[PDB]
Scaffold this motif. Structure first.
Motif, PDB file in Angstrom:
ATOM      1  N   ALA A  67       0.794  -1.218   0.000  1.00 40.29           N
ATOM      2  CA  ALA A  67       0.000   0.000   0.000  1.00 40.29           C
ATOM      3  C   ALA A  67       0.833   1.278   0.000  1.00 40.29           C
ATOM      4  CB  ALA A  67      -0.941  -0.006   1.207  1.00 40.29           C
ATOM      5  N   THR A  68       1.921   1.295   0.769  1.00 45.23           N
ATOM      6  CA  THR A  68       2.742   2.502   0.887  1.00 45.23           C
ATOM      7  C   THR A  68       4.277   2.372   0.890  1.00 45.23           C
ATOM      8  OG1 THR A  68       2.818   2.446   3.300  1.00 45.23           O
ATOM      9  CG2 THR A  68       0.881   3.450   2.286  1.00 45.23           C
ATOM     10  N   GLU A  69       4.802   1.159   1.028  1.00 46.40           N
ATOM     11  CA  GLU A  69       6.250   0.976   1.086  1.00 46.40           C
ATOM     12  C   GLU A  69       6.896   0.444  -0.195  1.00 46.40           C
ATOM     13  OE1 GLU A  69       7.770   2.270   3.336  1.00 46.40           O
ATOM     14  OE2 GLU A  69       6.703   2.157   5.255  1.00 46.40           O
ATOM     15  N   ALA A  70       8.071   0.977  -0.516  1.00 48.27           N
ATOM     16  CA  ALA A  70       8.800   0.565  -1.712  1.00 48.27           C
ATOM     17  C   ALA A  70       9.850  -0.481  -1.368  1.00 48.27           C
ATOM     18  CB  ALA A  70       9.488   1.785  -2.352  1.00 48.27           C
ATOM     19  N   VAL A  71      10.529  -0.982  -2.402  1.00 43.37           N
ATOM     20  CA  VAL A  71      11.624  -1.920  -2.214  1.00 43.37           C
ATOM     21  C   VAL A  71      12.731  -1.439  -3.147  1.00 43.37           C
ATOM     22  CG1 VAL A  71      10.191  -3.893  -1.552  1.00 43.37           C
ATOM     23  CG2 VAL A  71      10.713  -3.465  -3.984  1.00 43.37           C
ATOM     24  N   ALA A  72      13.964  -1.825  -2.842  1.00 46.63           N
ATOM     25  CA  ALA A  72      15.105  -1.424  -3.658  1.00 46.63           C
ATOM     26  C   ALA A  72      15.969  -2.633  -3.985  1.00 46.63           C
ATOM     27  CB  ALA A  72      15.932  -0.378  -2.916  1.00 46.63           C
ATOM     28  N   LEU A  73      16.661  -2.556  -5.113  1.00 46.85           N
ATOM     29  CA  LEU A  73      17.542  -3.638  -5.523  1.00 46.85           C
ATOM     30  C   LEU A  73      18.534  -4.037  -4.458  1.00 46.85           C
ATOM     31  CD1 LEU A  73      18.667  -2.702  -9.159  1.00 46.85           C
ATOM     32  CD2 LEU A  73      17.197  -4.648  -8.493  1.00 46.85           C
ATOM     33  N   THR A 139      14.545   0.955  -7.814  1.00 44.98           N
ATOM     34  CA  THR A 139      13.508   0.807  -6.806  1.00 44.98           C
ATOM     35  C   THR A 139      12.192   0.551  -7.516  1.00 44.98           C
ATOM     36  OG1 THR A 139      12.908   3.185  -6.740  1.00 44.98           O
ATOM     37  CG2 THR A 139      14.678   2.476  -5.278  1.00 44.98           C
ATOM     38  N   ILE A 140      11.258  -0.083  -6.809  1.00 39.42           N
ATOM     39  CA  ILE A 140       9.915  -0.305  -7.342  1.00 39.42           C
ATOM     40  C   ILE A 140       9.040   0.244  -6.222  1.00 39.42           C
ATOM     41  CG2 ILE A 140       8.131  -1.966  -8.019  1.00 39.42           C
ATOM     42  CD1 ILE A 140      10.327  -3.813  -9.001  1.00 39.42           C
ATOM     43  N   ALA A 141       8.360   1.354  -6.495  1.00 43.46           N
ATOM     44  CA  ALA A 141       7.519   2.005  -5.495  1.00 43.46           C
ATOM     45  C   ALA A 141       6.227   1.244  -5.246  1.00 43.46           C
ATOM     46  CB  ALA A 141       7.194   3.442  -5.940  1.00 43.46           C
ATOM     47  N   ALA A 142       5.618   1.518  -4.097  1.00 38.38           N
ATOM     48  CA  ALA A 142       4.356   0.892  -3.724  1.00 38.38           C
ATOM     49  C   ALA A 142       3.371   1.083  -4.856  1.00 38.38           C
ATOM     50  CB  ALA A 142       3.813   1.529  -2.445  1.00 38.38           C
ATOM     51  N   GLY A 143       2.786  -0.017  -5.316  1.00 40.30           N
ATOM     52  CA  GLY A 143       1.814   0.035  -6.389  1.00 40.30           C
ATOM     53  C   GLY A 143       2.383  -0.017  -7.788  1.00 40.30           C
ATOM     54  N   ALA A 144       3.708   0.013  -7.913  1.00 40.91           N
ATOM     55  CA  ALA A 144       4.339   0.004  -9.231  1.00 40.91           C
ATOM     56  C   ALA A 144       4.769  -1.378  -9.718  1.00 40.91           C
ATOM     57  CB  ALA A 144       5.561   0.949  -9.222  1.00 40.91           C
ATOM     58  N   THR A 145       4.986  -1.483 -11.023  1.00 39.41           N
ATOM     59  CA  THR A 145       5.452  -2.717 -11.641  1.00 39.41           C
ATOM     60  C   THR A 145       6.756  -2.403 -12.381  1.00 39.41           C
ATOM     61  OG1 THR A 145       3.258  -3.740 -11.902  1.00 39.41           O
ATOM     62  CG2 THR A 145       4.979  -4.462 -13.407  1.00 39.41           C
ATOM     63  N   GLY A 146       7.812  -3.145 -12.061  1.00 38.73           N
ATOM     64  CA  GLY A 146       9.098  -2.929 -12.706  1.00 38.73           C
ATOM     65  C   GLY A 146       9.417  -4.047 -13.684  1.00 38.73           C
ATOM     66  N   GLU A 147      10.135  -3.709 -14.755  1.00 38.65           N
ATOM     67  CA  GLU A 147      10.515  -4.670 -15.794  1.00 38.65           C
ATOM     68  C   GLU A 147      12.020  -4.920 -15.732  1.00 38.65           C
ATOM     69  OE1 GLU A 147       8.658  -6.366 -17.664  1.00 38.65           O
ATOM     70  OE2 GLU A 147       6.690  -5.376 -17.570  1.00 38.65           O
ATOM     71  N   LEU A 148      12.403  -6.190 -15.719  1.00 36.00           N
ATOM     72  CA  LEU A 148      13.806  -6.577 -15.599  1.00 36.00           C
ATOM     73  C   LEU A 148      14.278  -7.456 -16.740  1.00 36.00           C
ATOM     74  CD1 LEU A 148      12.454  -6.301 -12.606  1.00 36.00           C
ATOM     75  CD2 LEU A 148      14.464  -7.581 -11.848  1.00 36.00           C
ATOM     76  N   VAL A 192      13.013  -5.909   5.354  1.00 29.93           N
ATOM     77  CA  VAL A 192      14.065  -5.132   5.992  1.00 29.93           C
ATOM     78  C   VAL A 192      14.601  -6.004   7.127  1.00 29.93           C
ATOM     79  CG1 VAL A 192      14.616  -3.073   7.326  1.00 29.93           C
ATOM     80  CG2 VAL A 192      12.892  -2.950   5.514  1.00 29.93           C
ATOM     81  N   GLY A 193      15.923  -6.093   7.255  1.00 35.38           N
ATOM     82  CA  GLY A 193      16.488  -6.900   8.322  1.00 35.38           C
ATOM     83  C   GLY A 193      16.759  -8.350   7.960  1.00 35.38           C
ATOM     84  N   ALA A 194      16.175  -8.823   6.865  1.00 41.98           N
ATOM     85  CA  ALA A 194      16.395 -10.201   6.443  1.00 41.98           C
ATOM     86  C   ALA A 194      17.648 -10.270   5.562  1.00 41.98           C
ATOM     87  CB  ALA A 194      15.179 -10.711   5.680  1.00 41.98           C
ATOM     88  N   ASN A 195      18.185 -11.474   5.377  1.00 41.35           N
ATOM     89  CA  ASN A 195      19.392 -11.658   4.552  1.00 41.35           C
ATOM     90  C   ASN A 195      19.026 -11.419   3.080  1.00 41.35           C
ATOM     91  OD1 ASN A 195      21.703 -12.661   3.160  1.00 41.35           O
ATOM     92  ND2 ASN A 195      22.154 -14.044   4.862  1.00 41.35           N
ATOM     93  N   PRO A 196      19.682 -10.450   2.415  1.00 45.55           N
ATOM     94  CA  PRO A 196      19.388 -10.157   1.002  1.00 45.55           C
ATOM     95  C   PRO A 196      20.204 -10.958  -0.021  1.00 45.55           C
ATOM     96  CG  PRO A 196      20.928  -8.565   1.750  1.00 45.55           C
ATOM     97  CD  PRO A 196      20.598  -9.437   2.977  1.00 45.55           C
ATOM     98  N   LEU A 197      21.055 -11.863   0.449  1.00 43.84           N
ATOM     99  CA  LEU A 197      21.925 -12.641  -0.448  1.00 43.84           C
ATOM    100  C   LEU A 197      21.298 -13.197  -1.720  1.00 43.84           C
ATOM    101  CD1 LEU A 197      24.702 -14.026  -1.065  1.00 43.84           C
ATOM    102  CD2 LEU A 197      23.809 -16.008   0.181  1.00 43.84           C
ATOM    103  N   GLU A 198      20.194 -13.937  -1.575  1.00 41.32           N
ATOM    104  CA  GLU A 198      19.531 -14.571  -2.714  1.00 41.32           C
ATOM    105  C   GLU A 198      18.375 -13.779  -3.308  1.00 41.32           C
ATOM    106  OE1 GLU A 198      21.166 -17.013  -3.524  1.00 41.32           O
ATOM    107  OE2 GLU A 198      21.944 -18.059  -1.764  1.00 41.32           O
ATOM    108  N   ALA A 199      18.093 -12.610  -2.749  1.00 39.99           N
ATOM    109  CA  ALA A 199      16.970 -11.805  -3.214  1.00 39.99           C
ATOM    110  C   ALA A 199      17.298 -10.818  -4.327  1.00 39.99           C
ATOM    111  CB  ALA A 199      16.352 -11.062  -2.025  1.00 39.99           C
ATOM    112  N   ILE A 200      16.247 -10.317  -4.971  1.00 39.32           N
ATOM    113  CA  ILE A 200      16.382  -9.344  -6.051  1.00 39.32           C
ATOM    114  C   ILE A 200      16.071  -7.940  -5.500  1.00 39.32           C
ATOM    115  CG2 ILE A 200      15.564  -8.632  -8.335  1.00 39.32           C
ATOM    116  CD1 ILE A 200      14.677 -11.545  -8.835  1.00 39.32           C
ATOM    117  N   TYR A 201      15.034  -7.850  -4.664  1.00 39.10           N
ATOM    118  CA  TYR A 201      14.660  -6.584  -4.042  1.00 39.10           C
ATOM    119  C   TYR A 201      14.503  -6.755  -2.540  1.00 39.10           C
ATOM    120  CZ  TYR A 201      13.809  -4.351  -8.541  1.00 39.10           C
ATOM    121  OH  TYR A 201      13.969  -3.811  -9.792  1.00 39.10           O
ATOM    122  N   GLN A 202      14.779  -5.683  -1.800  1.00 39.23           N
ATOM    123  CA  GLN A 202      14.647  -5.699  -0.348  1.00 39.23           C
ATOM    124  C   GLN A 202      14.030  -4.376   0.081  1.00 39.23           C
ATOM    125  OE1 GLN A 202      18.365  -5.862   2.219  1.00 39.23           O
ATOM    126  NE2 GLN A 202      17.050  -7.093   3.559  1.00 39.23           N
ATOM    127  N   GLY A 203      13.177  -4.421   1.098  1.00 40.41           N
ATOM    128  CA  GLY A 203      12.564  -3.188   1.550  1.00 40.41           C
ATOM    129  C   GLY A 203      11.293  -3.414   2.342  1.00 40.41           C
TER     130      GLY A 203
END
Lengths: 370, 374, 371, 370, 147, 49, 49
Positions: A67-73, A139-148, A192-203
């Motif tokens: 609803a309101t929080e984004a995530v970042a690479l 970053t992919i903002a709340a409500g957005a769709t990113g293409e990779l 946030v706070g979790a291990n980002p090793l295997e992830a694409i986005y965190q936030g």
């Protein structure tokens, strides 16, 4: 004696093959899917000529439904679109078995620059990141769709000119297997706070992120129209009887100011080593390490270096630094090779060790099929 | 008369032994010394490296903390910046023969020339994966504000061997008797900071707060690169005798006497085989982007210029070598494939025909060359 | 066949000796400053000395935007369009390269392995960078402003510094070479909004009031002097010197959506590289108007049928970045396209979208024998 | 073979000559003149016996006609009363051709103390500078006239006991030529700021200084009553067929911190080397030099020394230091001798280089007439 | 630190070592001066000890004694500049061995002194010289300086 | 070494270490032959600070 | 400084080195003392190689 002639013949045959055959890059498979349903695929390449490798194109759309929080690479970002890769040849022998991020880092080491990247220059002519070959929104903002978009090169042959590790499949009949395990809604997003090793986005919006869909296209690179001679096809028997593989492993048990040694196995000729210091989910730019080295039992260190000096050697190889906590070692001209298991080890003496610390190792090596 | 066959045979034997040494020995890079010091107390050090096998060179890591204590004014990096952390480096082998003897800035520009890009730099790309300037291998804040402290890191490779594959210039250090010596003369509070209007050539920072800048400390670590476990044969150790009896040196000099629109010629000495030449036009403390020069050239006794070029075209040739331009007023010339050798042709000179000449103008020359130990 | 194998061996040996014995020289041939409103075509006369390898052409210009309020911005090719066309004729009046400035520039980049004579951006604190503005042009020229531009082109005769194939022996006192340079003028350099920017340097609402103030060029000739002499006179690589290494370009039209548009390699040349520019009716897109590109043989089989991004990936391995929008490159240097080794071959583009007046501008790099 | 006997015979003959002949020192010419009119003289020595050398006495009166400014001795002072000397033997072969100051410095090196000086001691007996053998007022005030005395020994024979370089003139008939060029009103006085190298006095009153007159007396030293044997006169053929010469040269092209090398020629056996660092008119006490050395191509430095240590070696030879910027090197026991030109060089690595800098070299050497 | 162990090179026959020593001394006293003692700069080195490759000790003495022997063998104060009536500017030009006679309150004096540590008796009599060609064992020249 | 060092006090310490090459005075296993003038031995000491 | 590299003499067969270490330590704290650790002066040398 011998061998001198075996190698001399191998090299002659390699040269004839490169000179007479014609290189082909051909699409063998494409598929679009939703990782909520499936994320593991077994691709069947074509059995034709001498196979050199596979170029794997991966595209994905990620929706942040928060609803309101984004995530970042994360530091690895799109390099984690493929979690793992495994290749089996027609004789049921495995070659590469490693993670997508390790495979990507080797692709970069072999290119001598970030793999398939676009270098920035002052040119007024509009060269640049025009085609977004490897790309992902920061970053992919709340409500957005990113293409990779991500590309990986799965090698069989060592290079375009060195066929060591290549696979003969113009005859074999039995099928090859290229296994690919893709990221899913459980691995791609880290809270946030979790291990980002295997992830694409965190936030903060991670729990509500999801894949809209993922697509992949595998292109197979091979040599066709193989040269024929008296006894038949002219082939580099040593090249084709050698495996060029990438493999990964994990090691734990690190303690502050104590040498943590990861032994190299015998038989394998190790061309490169990558060590990732996953310090309990934290990835630091050398500040948690005293030094790294490669050591021989009873012959000491051949390159015990502080982290920045170790990084300097890597800058000479890829023209930049690998991401935080990722360390590279080039041994291509003189591969680590011991007749005894662990007669050589990779060393990391940590300055700081958090809970759940470990070193994720990645290796590039040559070894005989027999 | 002939009998020159000896040379031909000597070259072949040298190349064969070089290859055997490279194939049989194993490369090692090892720390030999580390020190942290206050430049106010001392700035000159003599490092005694280890005598083990064939020495290829030294990687010197230098870090520093600089505080700008000025009440109100800042300072900014000069064009050379951290490359001026080391003012001069001089190496002597076990026989006490001098090899490289030059300025830190010259050594650094040659490190760049041989890499084919700014030495140990991190290129910028569009990669989404987080490569980049992660480790700050060579780094310095662009400015240091009044009251702030900046941290710097720079590296220099002091070569003995020409490269990792060409051992010409390498040093055999096995005589327990005499030690090698690597002398480092570092920057200090009198060389690192230039006031506005003063010559920035040898300084790291320049600006209105310069008089109040000071080093908190400087630290260095010398790593020695060498080949151990040298191959042995019927006649003992297999060694490239020409490689080990040849000096590969970097040296710099200064010349003055320039006048507008007149060719200023700096002669190359005989016997030396010059691989590269760097010419810095210190135009009385002003460093300009070619605008104070009509042309540069290399010329032989015959009025024959082999590359008389306008500054931008000269710069274009350099962009082909290091993928960018050297700093303002720094000009480079690659003669690696066909070294300048005054025996091959008449005397040869490096030419600069200046358009504008300020007071106290001079050309600072840096050379890379091979020469026989005897 | 023995006469050939021995002919090639003799050629390489001669080449190697020439390279070892001669000394390379690069020297100014001619400089001129002019207003293209007065004259834009120049025939430069190279000096007849030794073996000629190529010409480095420095071009500078000053452009003024006198529009009352609107600016103009660089087109994708920008300063590469300062020279519209280049044509070279040797002492026997045999034509070698004849192509556009933009095509020549793209080949210069392909051969360098990075944007030609560019300055790469790094984190170095030492002040390397764009210091000398070797190739440079302001991104925009505002109403009332004057911008300065610099551009360089390498016109090759010899293939490279070490491969003299295509080089020219110019030692005949009365037979002159000809290097014709056709420069941009106010008509070609400025494109109005909505007009095709292909040949232009700047495009924008202020275009109608833009004018060159001047253009200047300096041609430097690169050659080998003090040619080695043996027991038969000059030791010369006869095959190298009787082979032409040329660049040429052409335009092809007739594209329709989802249908393979095939451009046959119509000559018996040995094509080293191919550049295809999809001028989609004045629009230049980043692959989005294309399904795939490929090289195909009469056997109807594709050696590299690729989607646009994957095609671009191969190019990124060659020049470390992408060519401008709509420009596609194909490297065939190690195994040149030669229709006499396999059936006729074609370069293929299957367009997804085709606007009115769409066309493919083809640029070729190739070797062919004088006879 | 041979030679062993040639040298053995030479030495025997030398000994007989020294034992049987009688040494004579005789005035051959005296003259007083005004340098405004003439300053170059060609003295004709007597052709008698074996000539060993010439003692040249020079006296001069200098008047400072300036209204209010004085002048003071330069570092070389009266040693510049003779600017140059050249000697031609009866066979028209030149021996010494050098400057007066270089000749004087060699006279000092050979004596082992400042030439013809009076050493200061605590003796209560009134020994001392009683006779003013070599003398010049430290300053000549405006309106004053100073009296100077200088002596030079022009050697043919190497020493009183080594006749190498001596000249046989008891027969020759053809005349000898001892050419002397004296200081004049243009060379003796340097203005403040001008180069004092060749001057006698320097100061604010220099423009108005002039010679009242100069006088010289040449004394010839030779051996008479030569011993006769069977074949005739007993003579050391090697001694008489060898030239012992002093020569000077100038070299420029110095740059800070770079080795400036002056090559020694082949054939000559160099006994000593003097290098004067005329740093654009400034003469410093080693502070403008990093080091000096003598080097062999491909055999490195045989004596690379800092300036003070170089000076220490000289103190062992002349019991004091030569004037500022004057450096001496003794190679008498093992003369620099190369079969190839420049197989050995004299080195100066300057710390500071002013405009118009140069090294003025002076050499003492032996060489065959043939 | 004031004690150093120097490792000389092992090349041929070693005749001796010339040791150059310089120093800067500041008299920080508020009001009183100091003056050179009779030995002065000869006390810059307190003791010198040499060991050959076989670890045998040769000279082991005080700096002042070594200096007096250097003088005795030269036949005059070691490396001194004699005083003469010569008008030509010979003299103490290079300050080879030098020390201010006094250092006033607040002043800094500069000193230079040299010692010749002999192995061979002289340049022509090699009695006492050392053959240093065994790569194994090093010679050692120990210097204990003033502090 | 003083068992304690009080606030404001200075303590004096002495300690000795024997760095062995030979195993003992009678067993020369491990001893080092040092006669090559070329290469020096090296004893590195990293002290407390 | 706390790290030193000692160059021993090359004479005969080397058996070992006896290293004497002395130190003066002042506790400048205004009020609190310190006491020897279990190893105490044996930690005057941190490492020897």
């Amino acid at each position: 004696l011998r061998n001198q002639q075996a190698m001399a013949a191998n090299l002659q045959a390699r040269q004839i093959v490169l000179q007479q055959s014609y290189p082909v890059i051909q699409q063998v498979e494409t598929q679009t899917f939703d990782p909520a349903n499936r994320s593991v695929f077994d691709v069947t390449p074509a059995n034709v000529g001498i196979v050199k490798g596979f170029l794997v194109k991966v595209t994905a759309a990620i929706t942040n439904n928060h609803a309101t929080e984004a995530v970042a690479l994360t530091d690895f970002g799109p390099a984690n679109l493929v979690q793992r890769v495994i290749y089996y040849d027609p004789d049921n022998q495995r070659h590469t078995e490693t993670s997508g991020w390790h495979l990507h880092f080797v692709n970069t080491a072999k290119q001598g620059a970030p793999f398939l990247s676009s270098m920035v220059t002052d040119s007024p002519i509009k060269y640049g990141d025009v085609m977004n070959v490897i790309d992902a929104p920061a970053t992919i903002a709340a409500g957005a769709t990113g293409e990779l978009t991500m590309y990986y090169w799965v090698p069989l042959a060592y290079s375009e000119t060195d066929l060591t590790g290549a696979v003969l499949a113009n005859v074999p009949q039995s099928k090859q297997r290229l296994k690919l395990e893709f990221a899913n809604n459980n691995t791609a997003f880290a809270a946030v706070g979790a291990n980002p090793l295997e992830a694409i986005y965190q936030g903060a919006g991670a729990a509500d992120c999801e894949f809209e869909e993922i697509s992949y296209t595998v292109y197979q690179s091979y040599l066709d129209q193989l040269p024929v001679g008296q006894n038949g096809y002219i082939l580099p028997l040593i090249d084709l009887s050698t495996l060029y593989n990438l493999e990964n492993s994990a090691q734990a048990g690190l303690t502050p100011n104590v040498d943590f040694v990861v032994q190299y196995a015998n038989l394998y000729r190790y061309l490169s080593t990558i060590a990732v210091f996953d310090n309990g989910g934290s990835f630091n730019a050398g500040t948690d390490i005293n030094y790294l080295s490669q050591r021989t039992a009873n012959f000491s260190d051949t390159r015990k270096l502080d982290p920045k000096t170790w990084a300097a050697q890597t800058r000479r190889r890829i023209a930049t630094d690998f991401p935080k906590g990722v360390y590279y070692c080039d041994n291509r001209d003189k591969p680590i090779y011991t007749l005894q298991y662990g007669n050589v080890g990779f060393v990391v003496n940590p300055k700081t060790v958090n809970q759940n610390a470990r070193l994720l190792m990645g290796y590039e090596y040559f070894t005989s099929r027999t």
